[PDB]
Subunit: 110 residues, 2 copies
């Protein structure tokens, strides 16, 4: 899908996700820079107290037919992960919403 950002560092993802223009729930999926085989979901969040923030999530490889963040909720594929959390937040910070821009420094249409 568009959402797969390959191997940028935590930084380079934080700078993308910290764009004023991103809706809450904007995301990217990245490879696990220097701890590898795994992934990371990166989601922009917002609260009124602390403002724009972004949280990181490890996507574990079940060495198999499988990926998960929590043991309680498991997927066949990364597209199944993303399509689930797009519909239900299930204990993430927020539902998935936009895919992240690329960037420099991107303004969103209507």
């Amino acid at each position: 899908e568009e959402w797969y950002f390959g191997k940028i560092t935590r930084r380079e993802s934080e700078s993308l996700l910290l764009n004023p223009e991103n809706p809450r729930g904007t995301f990217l999926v990245r490879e696990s820079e220097t701890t590898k085989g795994a992934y990371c979901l990166s989601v922009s969040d917002f609260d009124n107290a602390k403002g724009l923030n972004v949280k990181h999530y490890k996507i574990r490889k079940l060495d198999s037919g499988g990926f998960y963040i929590t043991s309680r909720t498991q997927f066949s594929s990364l597209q199944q992960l993303v399509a689930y959390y797009s519909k239900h937040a299930d204990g993430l910070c927020h539902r998935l919403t936009n895919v992240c821009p690329t960037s420099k420094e991107f303004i969103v249409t209507d």
Copy 2:
């Protein structure tokens, strides 16, 4: 349970499990010598063609509430693993049966 053999090497388990006196399905659970955090189920097997043999199985740690050999069949605990495969073989070589002796060189009663 009795079945937990801590950290003997593959060898030291193969020599225990290769006792003529062991029923098919005799087992031990061991820690994963030099690849660690994981375990190994070790089961004595028999066929008429190849004779007494023993097969090894990795017990994966789900870094969590969980252990499994196959992704399709998962457990809360090591006692739940062992109690399942004691009842159903579910694609192992054999149902679990005896716990392994300790040894030197042990003969089984009736």
